[PDB]
Amino acid sequence: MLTELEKALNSIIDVYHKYSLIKGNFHAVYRDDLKKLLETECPQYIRKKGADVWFKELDINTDGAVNFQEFLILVIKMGVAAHKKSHEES
Template sequence: MEDLQTLQQALAVLVCTFQRYSKKEGDRYTLSKGELKELLENEFPSLGNVSAFEELRSLLDVNKDGEVDFEEYIRFVAVACTLCHEFFFDFPVVLPRGK
């Protein structure tokens, strides 16, 4: 039961994180260039200086409308999860601790 709650919490964090940034300016259903940059800088500090930000934004913006919608954001999250899964595959399964 605890694993189900943890997964539900993880999904809620993904959705709420998108919504927190997408509501800052313009269309609340998409991330503008500035909103996406702020999200990446704050939520993915391990990326460091996002020097390839424009390239990443271009890759995420599949429909080329200049913004990143929720589906495009989730594709990015899925790729990030896949990379983490592959990197940590042989490590013991331990949930990260909260702050």
């Protein structure tokens, strides 16, 4: 049996694979692949930053692709943002 946390992580990992398996190195997500991922699996408050800005931000070693570890940065930033949005006033 898998815990709730395991299921959530698996779904996150499933999302990455859906894009890394598109072309080229199947363990990497390229610029256009990421743009698709952002406008399809991410909320407005995250999308509106720009797919190119996000790519520049996620491609740490600047090899032209986003691998899993780098993708996890986006996942963490999204969690932090989601959490902050839940108890933020105006």
